[PDB]
Structure 1
Amino acid sequence: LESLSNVKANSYSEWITQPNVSRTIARELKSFLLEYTDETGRSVYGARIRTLGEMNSESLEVNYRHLAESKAILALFLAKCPEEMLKIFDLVAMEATELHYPDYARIHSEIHVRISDFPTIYSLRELRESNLSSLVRVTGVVTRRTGVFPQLYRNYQRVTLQEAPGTVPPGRLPRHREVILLADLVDVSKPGEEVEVTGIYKNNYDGNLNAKNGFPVFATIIEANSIKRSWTEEEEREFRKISRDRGIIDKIISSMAPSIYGHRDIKTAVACSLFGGVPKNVNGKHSIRGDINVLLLGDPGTAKSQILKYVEKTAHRAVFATGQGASAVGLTASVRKDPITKEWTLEGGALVLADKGVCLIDEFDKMNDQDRTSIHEAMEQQSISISKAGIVTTLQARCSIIAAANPNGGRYNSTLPLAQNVSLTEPILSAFDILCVVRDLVDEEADERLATFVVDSHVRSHPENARQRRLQRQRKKEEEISPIPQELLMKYIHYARTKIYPKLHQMDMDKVSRVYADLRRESISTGSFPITVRHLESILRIAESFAKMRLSEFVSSYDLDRAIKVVVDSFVDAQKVSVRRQLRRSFAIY
């Protein structure tokens, strides 16, 4: 009978709707759910049904590939006509599990099937017309989310999925689609999450829109069947090798922005902000952020903006903003109407998008204080609090910030402190971990080096198995200016961020506390800036980031020394000239 299902004289959906074929594959589905073999694992689905009936779970989960092995055409019919096939798979799963767990219908009326690990993946820009009425798997970001309400009852919810922040082509707004979520699949995600969902792609706005206007139009939606929120050993064979190489930290820093000369105290600050620290949440107490905050203040030139353009491409999820081009609404949240539930719905801004990512604010000084106040509370609380249009809620905004600014009058006053060179108020300055102060002072020593670098940078980036040949040539040029190929570094950073969570050793407690007390003693001795605990909190974070560079699970003494160097150097360099020279001699050891 299984072979007879292959022989089809009609369309794919037409053949399935036949009662004999429907009952044929219903028996075929029923046979598989208990009969399977995975060598040592044997009938894994027998245990799957066992634990599912143990939990009385409504979510009937299945792996896609396993069905295609025992029942070759049964799985392919499921893919081409998911609605028709899952309709009877509801009953087959009910009867097959009732073989193991009878009287299941006594409590639960239906068994909605959750498909998993579907292999074919589509992006929001690849949804061709041929993909209509078919099972599809897409990945995106949760921008808009509705509440939970019953539907003609069972739970219902509606969500929008938006393109990946770092993949939008220039000149286009981010493409997005409406997604339909059913019962038992509600509250699976929250705004700002990056998720992959499997569902059916179809048009469903027929009815009232037809007679509403001439040349009527509809919209495309995705009926969420199952949603999900990944490495291989062959790649880890490369990451582990480089992780223990000599000068791994120096290879990373020297590979930040290859075509930018000098500014090594920024490049090390960019490198640390990419890897980040380790967030902590003590139960019954407050949490601790792990994101590294960088402030780039300097005279016109010095490529502060080009750094933020390099961070945009290298980081995983980068959201770029500008002080004047942004608004208070455009950062925190916005409000949309929804006729399905009739309550107001909230859509997140730029800070919500960059959750578990980096938020870039170019020309940070030029925005108004009301716009700047939102950014301050964003870095402090890592969340957005809003009370607008009757909606009171909080969203996750765990993002790292890299800011470029300009001093008052367009030139840095070397004889005055940083707290008196910019309009940025001191409480907002305290939210930064690394404060880089770039001066542009003339000298033939630096100018010949810088110019000969730039004049070679332009002659390098000059425009003019062929794909492999071009990639090899680009790799050659990457090696000529950087120690590490860039796309490898992108993968290298992602693995370190995802896998490595380096931990402290209490053996280094003396190394940390003694330096802090020594730094505190000099603060009252010389200078007006008092050393705060937040500096020590900054030292540990960057110390963890340095350990995360080596892919070592424990903090070493070497990482702490470089961690102490960066924070002390920034604190010293921000002081006025008279105080600056005194502190450099007092901290020659560090």
Structure 2
Amino acid sequence: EIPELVPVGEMPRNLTMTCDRYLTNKVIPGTRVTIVGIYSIYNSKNSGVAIRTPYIKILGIQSDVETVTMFTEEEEEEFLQLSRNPKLYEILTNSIAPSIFGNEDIKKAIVCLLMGGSKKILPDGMRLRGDINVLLLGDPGTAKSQLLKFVEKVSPIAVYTSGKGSSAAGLTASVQRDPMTREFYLEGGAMVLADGGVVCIDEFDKMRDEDRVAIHEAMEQQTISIAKAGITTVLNSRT
């Protein structure tokens, strides 16, 4: 459920759905989506009287954008018609944040953070890290907080875990026992969800436990490998 529509005091619920092949693999986790389909009922025999469960049979995802680079041509026509007008660098700083008094040095740091640089796999073994990472420290009441919700909606992929670290060992990886075959496989992470885009966290004073020992490897080489009870695999990261 999109976490904005029914607030009284509740926690959100969840459903399940299937699809057909010529509309599968069209979604990544972390997006706004809309969907249209049926509300039929199956009955699994793995609780009282003979009760069944709900699920959606979907038909068509007329979603919003992906937020794998195929699109039409009239979109890029205006873009090239805008990109020839050489006023982009100054016109964005007024037009990015329509609710921010000035702050010109900070505002320019955000537009370069969103797009990034490149990545070299240059003909040797090693590589450079093509990314930038900023900080904002200062007095309360200088809009470092509410500026950060503003980058979340404008990003293609964004998460928002900005509080208290949230068990910094379980930020990157989690393994647990399984209902079927009792196995140890990889499930969760805050980084693996957030590749290609930007995370945003805070409170770098009163976390001393594991928050620093979890970001030292996660940054500067962007190549983690979990050495927990099952696998030891170097999964990619470009955060």
Range into which the TM-score falls when normalised by the shorter chain: 0.7 to 0.9
Given candidates 375, 384, 391, the residue that maps to 2:215 is 375
Structure 1 residue 206 and structure 2 residue 44: aligned? yes
Structure 1 residue 167 and structure 2 residue 32: aligned? yes
Tell me the secondary structure at the aligned position of residue 261 of structure 1.
coil
Equivalent residue, structure 1, for 2:23: 137
Cα distance change of structure 1 residues 328 and 369 upon mapping to structure 2, 3 Å threshold:
same
Deviations along 1:517-544, whole A, 9 cap, x unmatched?
xxxxxxxxxxxxxxxxxxxxxxxxxxxx
Tell me the secondary structure at the aligned position of residue 141 of structure 2.
coil
Tell me the secondary structure at the aligned position of residue 89 of structure 2.
helix
Deviation at 1:384, TM superposition (A): 2.7
TM-score by length of 2: 0.73
How far apart, in 2, do the equivalents of 1:125 and 1:276 lie?
37
2:191 aligned partner, one-letter code = L
The answer (yes or no) to whether the contact 1:166–1:313 under 8 Å persists in 2 is: no
Tell me the secondary structure at the aligned position of residue 137 of structure 2.
strand
Q: What are the residue-to-residue correspondences of 1:182-197 with 2, within 5 Å?
A: none
Deviations along 1:537-587, whole A, 9 cap, x unmatched?
xxxxxxxxxxxxxxxxxxxxxxxxxxxxxxxxxxxxxxxxxxxxxxxxxxx
2:32 aligned partner, one-letter code = T
Tell me the secondary structure at the aligned position of residue 377 of structure 1.
helix
Choose between structure 1 and 2: higher helix proportion.
Answer: 1
Equivalent residue, structure 2, for 1:238: 78
1:383 aligned partner, one-letter code = T
Q: Identical aligned pairs, as a percentage?
A: 51
2:189 aligned partner, one-letter code = G
Deviations along 1:8-32, whole A, 9 cap, x unmatched?
xxxxxxxxxxxxxxxxxxxxxxxxx
Cα distance change of structure 1 residues 219 and 285 upon mapping to structure 2, 3 Å threshold:
farther
Structure 1 residue 257 and structure 2 residue 97: aligned? yes
Cα distance change of structure 1 residues 326 and 248 upon mapping to structure 2, 3 Å threshold:
same
Deviation at 1:326, TM superposition (A): 1.4
Equivalent residue, structure 2, for 1:337: 177
Unaligned runs of 5+ in 2: 1-13, 34-39, 58-67
Alignment size in residue pairs: 208
Unaligned runs of 5+ in 1: 1-123, 142-162, 169-201, 223-228, 400-590
Equivalent residue, structure 2, for 1:298: 138
Structure 1 residue 310 and structure 2 residue 197: aligned? no
Cα distance change of structure 1 residues 313 and 216 upon mapping to structure 2, 3 Å threshold:
same
The answer (yes or no) to whether the contact 1:323–1:364 under 8 Å persists in 2 is: no
How far apart, in 1, do the equivalents of 2:208 and 2:163 lie?
8
The answer (yes or no) to whether the contact 2:117–2:131 under 8 Å persists in 1 is: yes
Tell me the secondary structure at the aligned position of residue 282 of structure 1.
coil
Deviation at 1:136, TM superposition (A): 6.6
How far apart, in 2, do the equivalents of 1:328 and 1:234 lie?
45
How far apart, in 2, do the equivalents of 1:397 and 1:280 lie?
14
How far apart, in 2, do the equivalents of 1:310 and 1:133 lie?
34
Cα distance change of structure 1 residues 323 and 369 upon mapping to structure 2, 3 Å threshold:
farther
Choose between structure 1 and 2: higher strand proportion.
Answer: 1
Deviations along 1:32-63, whole A, 9 cap, x unmatched?
xxxxxxxxxxxxxxxxxxxxxxxxxxxxxxxx
Deviations along 1:319-343, whole A, 9 cap, x unmatched?
1122415112441011133455543
The answer (yes or no) to whether the contact 1:333–1:347 under 8 Å persists in 2 is: yes
Cα distance change of structure 1 residues 126 and 314 upon mapping to structure 2, 3 Å threshold:
farther
2:44 aligned partner, one-letter code = D
Given candidates 346, 367, 383, the residue that maps to 2:186 is 346
1:258 aligned partner, one-letter code = P
The answer (yes or no) to whether the contact 2:169–2:210 under 8 Å persists in 1 is: no
The answer (yes or no) to whether the contact 1:384–1:396 under 8 Å persists in 2 is: yes
1:140 aligned partner, one-letter code = V
Tell me the secondary structure at the aligned position of residue 355 of structure 1.
coil
Deviation at 1:292, TM superposition (A): 1.8
The answer (yes or no) to whether the contact 1:332–1:351 under 8 Å persists in 2 is: yes
Tell me the secondary structure at the aligned position of residue 226 of structure 2.
strand
Tell me the secondary structure at the aligned position of residue 298 of structure 1.
coil
Deviation at 1:352, TM superposition (A): 1.3
